[PDB]
Amino acid sequence: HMNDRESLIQALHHTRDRVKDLVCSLREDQLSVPYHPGVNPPVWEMGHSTFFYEVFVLNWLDGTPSYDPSMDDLWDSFHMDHEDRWSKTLFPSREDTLAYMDTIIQRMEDRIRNQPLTDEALYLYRYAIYHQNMHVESMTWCRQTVGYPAPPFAEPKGLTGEGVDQDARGDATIPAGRYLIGLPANRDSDAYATEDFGFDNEKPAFEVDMPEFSISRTLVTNGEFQKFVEEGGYERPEFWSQGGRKWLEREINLNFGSGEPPLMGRQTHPFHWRKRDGRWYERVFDQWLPLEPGHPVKQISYWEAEAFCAWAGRRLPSEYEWEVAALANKPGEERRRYPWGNEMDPAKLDMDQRYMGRVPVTAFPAGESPFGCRQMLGTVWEWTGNQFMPYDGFSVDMYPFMSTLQFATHKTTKGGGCAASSMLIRGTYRQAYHPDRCDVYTGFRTCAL
Numbered sequence: 001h002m003n004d005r006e007s008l009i010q011a012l013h014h015t016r017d018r019v020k021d022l023v024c025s026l027r028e029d030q031l032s033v034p035y036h037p038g039v040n041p042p043v044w045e046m047g048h049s050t051f052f053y054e055v056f057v058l059n060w061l062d063g064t065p066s067y068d069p070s071m072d073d074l075w076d077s078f079h080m081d082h083e084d085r086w087s088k089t090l091f092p093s094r095e096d097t098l099a100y101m102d103t104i105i106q107r108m109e110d111r112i113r114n115q116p117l118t119d120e121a122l123y124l125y126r127y128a129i130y131h132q133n134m135h136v137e138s139m140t141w142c143r144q145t146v147g148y149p150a151p152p153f154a155e156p157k158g159l160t161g162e163g164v165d166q167d168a169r170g171d172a173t174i175p176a177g178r179y180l181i182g183l184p185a186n187r188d189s190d191a192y193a194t195e196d197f198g199f200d201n202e203k204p205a206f207e208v209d210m211p212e213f214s215i216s217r218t219l220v221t222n223g224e225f226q227k228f229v230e231e232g233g234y235e236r237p238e239f240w241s242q243g244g245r246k247w248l249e250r251e252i253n254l255n256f257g258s259g260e261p262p263l264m265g266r267q268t269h270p271f272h273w274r275k276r277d278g279r280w281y282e283r284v285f286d287q288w289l290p291l292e293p294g295h296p297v298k299q300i301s302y303w304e305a306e307a308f309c310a311w312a313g314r315r316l317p318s319e320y321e322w323e324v325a326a327l328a329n330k331p332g333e334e335r336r337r338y339p340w341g342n343e344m345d346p347a348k349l350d351m352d353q354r355y356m357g358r359v360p361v362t363a364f365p366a367g368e369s370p371f372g373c374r375q376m377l378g379t380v381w382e383w384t385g386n387q388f389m390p391y392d393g394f395s396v397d398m399y400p401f402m403s404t405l406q407f408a409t410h411k412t413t414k415g416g417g418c419a420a421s422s423m424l425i426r427g428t429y430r431q432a433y434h435p436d437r438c439d440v441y442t443g444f445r446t447c448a449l
């Protein structure tokens with residue numbers, strides 16, 4: 001699991017190598033990426049994700065000073081502003097920043113090893129490693145947005161071998177009743193650092209009288225979404241909401257990521273789609289691969305999903321509806337953090353930056369939920385209808401900006417993404433994304449009206 005020095009130390013090394021492979025694989029000319037509201041300079045993410053260790057572990061527990069105190073405000077995500085991260089005068093070189101990382105990674109490992117494994121240190125150990133892995137995803141989707149080559153550790157072609165399409169397709173009517181949502185608060189549990197670990201957005205736990213509903217056991221596929229495109233949905237202003245219709249009227253460079261000159265216009269299909277000689281294609285980092293039909297529709301907005309749900313007479317689930325259909329945890333019963341149980345097998349889901357969402361929607365049957373819903377935890381951040389809002393009883397974490405900057409404006413997505421790492425995923429997990437975003441690995445399944 002994640003209660004072992006070994007597991008932590010292995011996770012720390014896996015993460016550092018992920019970051020290292022992400023930044024060294026780039027050419028010096030590529031380290032300064034094209035500006036985009038959702039991307040960040042990769043060397044900065046390496047430094048920033050390393051500073052978190054110094055702040056919320058090394059200095060937090062031992063008072064250890066910073067490696068270079070001069071950068072203690074330039075690595076901070078709250079203090080530093082997005083546009084000023086593309087400086088090349090304020091920030092050290094990829095070579096010097098790599099040393100900074102490797103030094104702090106060693107300091108981290110040394111403390112994990114040569115200092116007591118208090119529940120406090122464990123909670124902080126995991127929080128920090130996870131935060132770096134949250135940036136492994138950011139750096140990975142930066143490459144997709146700016147059109148850089150795929151990360152070395154990735155297999156973006158996807159599960160081509162297990163290309164399949166079982167009869168699992170269908171909605172699962174879920175039994176009504178009282179279900180348990182979320183994780184216990186850290187003060188109310190002596191396992192806050194172990195079996196009850198979660199971020200502030202997942203706490204405090206609560207119960208819900210849930211009416212029965214039917215949710216598709218399968219994610220919406222490229223082919224299913226194709227019909228909505230072919231039927232002119234993006235031009236039918238009826239299936240789109242007020243914000244959806246405003247999002248439809250945006251004028252954006254539809255050629256961002258493509259090495260082709262800027263082309264300003266309105267979106268008529270998923271941003272990363274393009275029809276070539278009648279065949280639908282999809283940009284996969286530096287290549288335009290054919291859009292396989294049984295693969296999930298990915299990198300689409302909440303409005304694109306909203307419109308599809310209306311055009312299909314279906315609905316988006318709520319995040320509570322989602323969690324009960326994923327873990328089916330009921331108050332007083334034994335609970336599970338994963339739809340398959342409480343032990344994590346990286347093989348039961350498309351995560352850890354590998355198949356990159358190009359998996360048959362009806363794959364990973366071992367990660368099936370109690371209700372038969374497949375590929376819930378992972379593949380693509382599934383849009384929900386609820387707005388990211390604090391659970392009643394919210395308490396900020398030691399990192400108080402984990403959720404407080406993304407309330408109301410953002411929508412709750414659940415599950416996990418091809419670019420997100422498996423050590424941090426949980427059914428209770430909540431990831432906020434702005435509903436206008438098409439740069440993140442988002443998808444959706446549909447409920448029944």
Ligand SMILES: N[C@@H](Cc1c[nH]c[nH+]1)C(=O)O
Nearest residue numbers: 134135401402403406432
């Ligand atoms: N809530 C923050 C958490 C985070 C910090 N760094 C990366 N991610 C976010 O989703 O962006």
Ligand SMILES: [Fe+3]
Nearest residue numbers: 048077131135
């Ligand atoms: Fe961060």
Ligand code: NA
Nearest residue numbers: 376378380415
């Ligand atoms: Na998912």
